[PDB]
Amino acid sequence: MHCPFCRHPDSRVVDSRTTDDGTSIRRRRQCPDCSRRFTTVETCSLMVVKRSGVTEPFSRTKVINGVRKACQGRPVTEDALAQLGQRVEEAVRATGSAELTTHDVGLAILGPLQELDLVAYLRFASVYRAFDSLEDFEAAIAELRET
Amino acid sequence: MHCPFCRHPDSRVVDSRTTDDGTSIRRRRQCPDCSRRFTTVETCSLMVVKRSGVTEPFSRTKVINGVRKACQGRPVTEDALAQLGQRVEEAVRATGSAELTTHDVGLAILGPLQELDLVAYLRFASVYRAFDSLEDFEAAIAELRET
Amino acid sequence: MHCPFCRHPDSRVVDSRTTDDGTSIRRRRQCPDCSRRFTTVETCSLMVVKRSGVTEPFSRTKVINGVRKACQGRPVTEDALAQLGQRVEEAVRATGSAELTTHDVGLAILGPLQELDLVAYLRFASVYRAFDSLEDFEAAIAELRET
Amino acid sequence: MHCPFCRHPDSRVVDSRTTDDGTSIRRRRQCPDCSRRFTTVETCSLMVVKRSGVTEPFSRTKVINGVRKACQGRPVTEDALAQLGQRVEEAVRATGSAELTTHDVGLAILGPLQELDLVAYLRFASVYRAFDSLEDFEAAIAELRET
Amino acid sequence: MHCPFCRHPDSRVVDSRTTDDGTSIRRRRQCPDCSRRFTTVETCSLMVVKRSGVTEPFSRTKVINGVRKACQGRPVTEDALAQLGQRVEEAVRATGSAELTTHDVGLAILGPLQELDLVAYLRFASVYRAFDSLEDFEAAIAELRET
Amino acid sequence: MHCPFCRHPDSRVVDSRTTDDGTSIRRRRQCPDCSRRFTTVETCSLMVVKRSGVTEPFSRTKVINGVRKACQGRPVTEDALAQLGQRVEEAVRATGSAELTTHDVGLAILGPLQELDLVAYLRFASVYRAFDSLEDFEAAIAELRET
Amino acid sequence: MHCPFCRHPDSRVVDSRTTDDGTSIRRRRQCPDCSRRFTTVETCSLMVVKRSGVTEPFSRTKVINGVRKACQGRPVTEDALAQLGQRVEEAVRATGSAELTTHDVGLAILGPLQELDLVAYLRFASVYRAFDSLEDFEAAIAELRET
Amino acid sequence: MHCPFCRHPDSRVVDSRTTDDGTSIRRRRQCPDCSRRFTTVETCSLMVVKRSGVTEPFSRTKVINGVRKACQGRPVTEDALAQLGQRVEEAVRATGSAELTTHDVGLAILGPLQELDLVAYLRFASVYRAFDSLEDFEAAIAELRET
Ligand SMILES: Nc1ncnc2c1ncn2[C@@H]1O[C@H](COP(=O)(O)OP(=O)(O)OP(=O)(O)O)[C@@H](O)[C@H]1O
Ligand SMILES: Nc1ncnc2c1ncn2[C@@H]1O[C@H](COP(=O)(O)OP(=O)(O)OP(=O)(O)O)[C@@H](O)[C@H]1O
Ligand SMILES: Nc1ncnc2c1ncn2[C@@H]1O[C@H](COP(=O)(O)OP(=O)(O)OP(=O)(O)O)[C@@H](O)[C@H]1O
Ligand SMILES: Nc1ncnc2c1ncn2[C@@H]1O[C@H](COP(=O)(O)OP(=O)(O)OP(=O)(O)O)[C@@H](O)[C@H]1O
Ligand SMILES: Nc1ncnc2c1ncn2[C@@H]1O[C@H](COP(=O)(O)OP(=O)(O)OP(=O)(O)O)[C@@H](O)[C@H]1O
Ligand SMILES: Nc1ncnc2c1ncn2[C@@H]1O[C@H](COP(=O)(O)OP(=O)(O)OP(=O)(O)O)[C@@H](O)[C@H]1O
Ligand SMILES: Nc1ncnc2c1ncn2[C@@H]1O[C@H](COP(=O)(O)OP(=O)(O)OP(=O)(O)O)[C@@H](O)[C@H]1O
Ligand SMILES: Nc1ncnc2c1ncn2[C@@H]1O[C@H](COP(=O)(O)OP(=O)(O)OP(=O)(O)O)[C@@H](O)[C@H]1O
Ligand SMILES: Nc1ncnc2c1ncn2[C@H]1C[C@H](O)[C@@H](COP(=O)(O)OP(=O)(O)OP(=O)(O)O)O1
Ligand SMILES: Nc1ncnc2c1ncn2[C@H]1C[C@H](O)[C@@H](COP(=O)(O)OP(=O)(O)OP(=O)(O)O)O1
Ligand SMILES: Nc1ncnc2c1ncn2[C@H]1C[C@H](O)[C@@H](COP(=O)(O)OP(=O)(O)OP(=O)(O)O)O1
Ligand SMILES: Nc1ncnc2c1ncn2[C@H]1C[C@H](O)[C@@H](COP(=O)(O)OP(=O)(O)OP(=O)(O)O)O1
Ligand SMILES: Nc1ncnc2c1ncn2[C@H]1C[C@H](O)[C@@H](COP(=O)(O)OP(=O)(O)OP(=O)(O)O)O1
Ligand SMILES: Nc1ncnc2c1ncn2[C@H]1C[C@H](O)[C@@H](COP(=O)(O)OP(=O)(O)OP(=O)(O)O)O1
Ligand SMILES: Nc1ncnc2c1ncn2[C@H]1C[C@H](O)[C@@H](COP(=O)(O)OP(=O)(O)OP(=O)(O)O)O1
Ligand SMILES: Nc1ncnc2c1ncn2[C@H]1C[C@H](O)[C@@H](COP(=O)(O)OP(=O)(O)OP(=O)(O)O)O1
Ligand SMILES: [Zn+2]
Ligand SMILES: [Zn+2]
Ligand SMILES: [Zn+2]
Ligand SMILES: [Zn+2]
Ligand SMILES: [Zn+2]
Ligand SMILES: [Zn+2]
Ligand SMILES: [Zn+2]
Ligand SMILES: [Zn+2]
Known part of the structure; x- marks a missing residue:
């Protein structure tokens, strides 16, 4: 080198x-x-096994872009978005596995995301969990109220 | 001339x-x-007054991009959202105002998007309107149940 | 139609x-x-005769993007940028000519720009006027102080 | 492993x-x-601490883009700024800290950019540092005269 | 599996x-x-046998690009040609062969394109078939008059 | 479906x-x-584990593009290139594994490639095998002569 | 310089x-x-006043690409296409005007194009002259037969 | 004028x-x-006569792309090949012919590329010259041993 x-x-x-x-x-x-x-x-190169089976390199840029799409018109600064991306990356590397599915990265985004913006969490969970109808959003609202 | x-x-x-x-x-x-x-x-000049008070020509692609962002992960085909956008342009040119606030444009898109997709309506209403807390999502949900 | x-x-x-x-x-x-x-x-289609002689269509988007490049890390909101772009477009269409050179558009940007951010004016004048050395910036600072 | x-x-x-x-x-x-x-x-991990407190790998292209934005309209060839960036990476890896704030990265770039271009230095210093009023540009100019 | x-x-x-x-x-x-x-x-595998004897999956975008090239300068909207392509895919999957030569694909597209546009049909037939001399264009024209 | x-x-x-x-x-x-x-x-989706560890979807288009880069100015038609791509795809799917390394795909390209153009084989082996010096090309020439 | x-x-x-x-x-x-x-x-920079009024720089690459689109599946080599592009450029510069409309460039393409491929001429005239129906192609066929 | x-x-x-x-x-x-x-x-007009007999301005990017294709998979940095191209332009403008065949351009690039990379020289010589059989690669190899 x-x-x-x-x-x-x-x-x-x-x-x-x-x-x-x-x-x-x-x-x-x-x-x-x-x-x-x-x-x-x-x-090891952190790989993300996309839902099509493609193992792309892990990029906190994609995580931050998705969270920013959720965090539209919210009191969430770029500093907060970068901090959330860093937290997600730290959690997924502390998991230890080289390949994590996009589901694992989505979960690692969701639990911290509640702290940055609960409403942004709803928009991120709706796209990520593929909420079929308002029943799914009401169920998501319930879980956010249940601790 | x-x-x-x-x-x-x-x-x-x-x-x-x-x-x-x-x-x-x-x-x-x-x-x-x-x-x-x-x-x-x-x-014919459709000229929307943005939230900043400036005036812009009524562009199809702005409505198209707004709907596509709301619909990400929902089954709306690029053709269906293009139709939503055509329908919105037809409705707003029809109102015959020729100078409408983007609030009017947002209201024009929401009524068709309720027919096109409810998860998208909540995601479009959530970003369009403030939706500061889960209470706004419950109020909007109540509103969509009513209808 | x-x-x-x-x-x-x-x-x-x-x-x-x-x-x-x-x-x-x-x-x-x-x-x-x-x-x-x-x-x-x-x-008439407002044309901008670029400095290469190309007559592109007039787009306030390019004006706002250039001003935003000047207005980096400044207390200048997107609303202010859009208002400045609208003012520049209004001035250049009130001029009446179908083709304006990029120099004319730059001048139409500069005189209002002093009101939005004098420091951003300096960064816009330096790139636009192609300020050769600190003598050009000192001369520009003088003119901003002279009314 | x-x-x-x-x-x-x-x-x-x-x-x-x-x-x-x-x-x-x-x-x-x-x-x-x-x-x-x-x-x-x-x-070897050069990991810059951003202004948000997050940690990112030391990327050449960030320095390259910062210099290019500062140099727009000044004669610096894509080769000269690539060299500035190589020189900055060599200097910061050299300091041997392995974890440096982006403030250190900005200081590292400015001393070479004074040699590469003074209009760019004022444009880089203006964006990097706050430069709220023309007084900051006069103070920086005074600083560049001193040297 | x-x-x-x-x-x-x-x-x-x-x-x-x-x-x-x-x-x-x-x-x-x-x-x-x-x-x-x-x-x-x-x-379900629609697998077209190209003129080279190789086998490729039946792709919508190939038909779409072929029609768009034929229609350049004719009023067919991107929606109309997308429909032509949908109609062709429906017809060829319907025939139920599951392994068809691209000659069959070309014949499938031509009958709908006669309804969509005649200048496009001559331009599509001209490129698809050889059309070595003006006599081929007169024969095809005669064929379109007949119908 | x-x-x-x-x-x-x-x-x-x-x-x-x-x-x-x-x-x-x-x-x-x-x-x-x-x-x-x-x-x-x-x-199963045929995956190609790229040399960076990324498992992209298998695409005969990339194989044909690489072979075409090797087959520059040669008596090798697009039909022959497509046939070689089909042969490579058939061989790698007859292998049976869902993930093949780029090395396996390169080998599956090389043995048929000798039949389409031995000189193109040399240009493909030189880039693919990363032939260090003319000793590697002489060794490759030897193997082509040895059956 | x-x-x-x-x-x-x-x-x-x-x-x-x-x-x-x-x-x-x-x-x-x-x-x-x-x-x-x-x-x-x-x-002088040869300018092409596009049909939207934009005066792009003259590029024989666009001329050759358009002719190649007309010359699809024809006995017309890339050498012949380049020669036709050179002839068109030579004719339009021998005209002497700095700005030529796209109509003038189209005419300068058409008269030589008959020599390279009369059938390609038909496909180029149909897109360029915007032939409305087979009556326009029959009229074009007549003129090609009339000297 | x-x-x-x-x-x-x-x-x-x-x-x-x-x-x-x-x-x-x-x-x-x-x-x-x-x-x-x-x-x-x-x-100053450097105007290369292509193999088709047409005349084109001497473009850096053509030489750059030719060298990059030859060097794929060899360590030549984008800076080194840009230099090769600068060196070639300096040599051909120097010869002072002002109208040179692309054969002269190819010869100009090959002598510097032998210094830059020998695998690239064989790959550039192989594509540039015909290299019909392995015998041409052995003759060129012999030629590079000689030197
Ligand atoms: N390569 C990657 N590296 C890091 N994070 C990623 C990567 N790809 C996706 N992500 C993030 O992981 C989360 C999972 O998103 P999601 O599972 O909906 O995406 P996906 O698998 O790419 O979906 P689709 O293929 O349906 O578009 C998102 O926040 C996304 O931004
Ligand atoms: N130029 C435009 N032409 C047509 N529709 C537009 C245009 N600009 C915005 N819209 C649409 O009108 C609505 C306005 O939404 P919203 O009030 O959130 O944004 P805005 O007025 O552009 O303000 P902001 O500065 O927050 O972007 C959206 O649905 C958007 O797609
Ligand atoms: N087509 C256009 N419509 C409206 N404004 C434009 C257009 N092109 C450029 N501008 C703006 O006009 C101003 C003049 O900029 P400037 O003269 O430096 O650009 P330019 O002529 O395109 O320069 P260059 O060709 O050297 O990059 C800038 O603020 C720029 O954003
Ligand atoms: N990841 C990085 N690797 C290397 N250099 C970087 C990186 N990020 C930023 N830099 C450089 O370090 C300097 C930091 O500048 P600055 O303090 O204005 O921005 P910042 O720390 O990224 O904060 P902000 O949130 O305002 O962008 C710049 O010169 C920038 O090009
Ligand atoms: N993979 C494909 N899937 C679906 N339709 C296709 C596919 N490839 C070609 N087609 C269509 O089938 C027709 C075949 O046309 P044509 O015979 O001129 O080309 P071809 O068989 O691809 O041969 P060539 O080597 O000349 O391109 C066209 O209308 C084309 O759009
Ligand atoms: N996703 C893919 N599907 C099918 N074939 C592929 C794919 N990626 C590469 N290939 C082909 O497999 C062969 C192996 O090429 P090679 O191993 O040199 O590429 P690579 O692993 O992508 O290299 P690099 O990362 O160094 O650019 C080539 O012919 C290439 O075109
Ligand atoms: N900038 C240019 N320089 C040289 N030739 C050009 C240029 N632009 C277009 N041409 C060529 O001139 C001819 C005229 O084409 P045509 O008038 O149909 O195009 P156009 O004016 O760009 O049309 P449209 O705007 O409707 O797409 C074509 O052969 C085209 O390739
Ligand atoms: N316009 C140009 N300006 C400068 N160098 C050029 C230009 N065109 C080609 N060259 C270079 O000159 C050499 C000519 O190579 P070659 O004889 O194989 O191609 P050619 O003359 O373009 O013929 P062909 O029709 O086969 O492409 C190459 O190294 C190429 O990069
Ligand atoms: N319009 C949206 N509103 C709210 N959240 C969104 C929106 N779009 C995306 N998200 C959130 C939830 C998604 O699971 C996450 C990532 O979206 P997506 O576009 O799939 O990103 P990605 O990084 O996976 O991209 P790609 O699949 O293209 O690589 O971001
Ligand atoms: N991530 C998102 N998820 C869902 N809907 C979204 C998302 N981002 C934006 N939207 C919707 C709601 C907004 O009212 C609409 C348009 O938003 P915006 O990004 O401001 O573009 P715009 O059309 O207003 O452009 P501009 O204001 O720059 O001219 O799209
Ligand atoms: N880095 C910068 N810092 C400050 N002002 C800038 C910067 N870059 C551009 N500007 C300002 C002054 C320029 O004259 C103006 C337009 O820049 P430029 O990139 O030439 O825009 P443009 O709209 O003319 O683009 P283009 O020429 O690509 O069409 O914006
Ligand atoms: N318009 C501009 N004109 C001149 N210099 C500029 C301009 N914009 C940015 N710079 C300079 C000063 C900044 O310190 C440096 C980098 O700015 P920035 O846009 O924040 O990118 P970055 O490298 O910090 O990326 P990020 O923070 O997103 O990771 O470039
Ligand atoms: N310039 C053109 N004008 C009109 N129609 C065209 C033109 N070029 C192609 N077409 C039509 C006729 C062809 O049968 C059809 C598809 O042509 P082609 O370029 O061979 O693509 P393809 O779909 O066959 O792809 P491929 O063979 O590479 O897989 O499109
Ligand atoms: N210039 C060249 N001359 C001869 N053969 C080449 C050339 N470039 C590439 N090849 C051949 C050998 C390479 O292993 C093969 C694939 O090249 P490469 O560009 O790595 O393709 P790829 O499909 O792997 O692309 P990527 O890595 O960008 O996805 O093609
Ligand atoms: N599908 C086609 N079949 C036959 N001739 C064609 C086809 N498409 C284009 N042509 C011919 C006639 C057109 O007038 C000419 C140029 O086409 P066009 O796409 O308008 O090129 P252009 O160079 O003007 O592009 P642009 O307008 O995008 O700059 O080429
Ligand atoms: N795949 C390749 N591998 C190695 N060298 C290559 C490859 N393809 C081309 N070259 C080299 C040898 C050629 O003489 C040179 C330029 O080739 P070519 O593709 O004809 O472009 P060009 O510069 O001649 O453009 P044009 O002739 O279209 O104007 O690059
Ligand atoms: Zn007049
Ligand atoms: Zn009516
Ligand atoms: Zn193991
Ligand atoms: Zn050392
Ligand atoms: Zn198993
Ligand atoms: Zn059915
Ligand atoms: Zn005059
Ligand atoms: Zn000299």
């Missing part, structure tokens, strides 16, 4: 160790140009 | 092409004085 | 008259389907 | 492709237990 | 979403043996 | 059986509108 | 003369870096 | 903007006779 301090095309791994739980590998490497050691973390 | 460049009282229509869905006919006109083409568009 | 009340493919002009100053033609027409008269205004 | 799906302590690197400009090496790894490919990306 | 990865005779349908215009239902299925999602699509 | 003959929104499965090897499920269904039975095949 | 031989940012015009008919200006310039003189031609 | 619309011997340059990478300066000029803006572009 190209040295952050010397831009060398090639570098050698002088240390490679497994991190706790093995969710990452710590690889320190010595460059041959400026001889400055640099450490790197090798982590 | 007066040439826009030299103000000659007469100007002949070299060519005239209509818009098939647009109530606009685009005409290329020659001015006999300076011999300069100029393009004119003939259209 | 298709009737706003009857959707007929073809209609006949039963009255055509020239408006004051000839900036528009008033054409009333009778439809053959529902026999409801409708009046229309035939106006 | 532990397979993300069954947690097997050893997992062989089927393939490994580096990113030429990216300090990222993408590796496909097989798990001997469940025989399932999984993708890992090895990268 | 047999899991594609371990061939387990039974596999439960975790989820099933239909295509609204597509005669395709997309199902996510779990295999109890290896616990791996897999996506299946359920569709 | 919407009836091919009656367009009904909903239909019921009146027969569902597993095909030989379980690569598909045969589902015959009776519509409620025109009461015409229609049979459908439910098959 | 940047020297072709020294890449200098600025150069001075050491000779500027008007060419015959004034369709171009011959400007020879001496660079200050490598002191190598280079001559340049300053010509 | 003579006005293109009325042929007035003198026409003043209202404005003049250069192209930074382009050897083109775009000037808006007023004609005192008819008072009509017109746009002129001043450029």
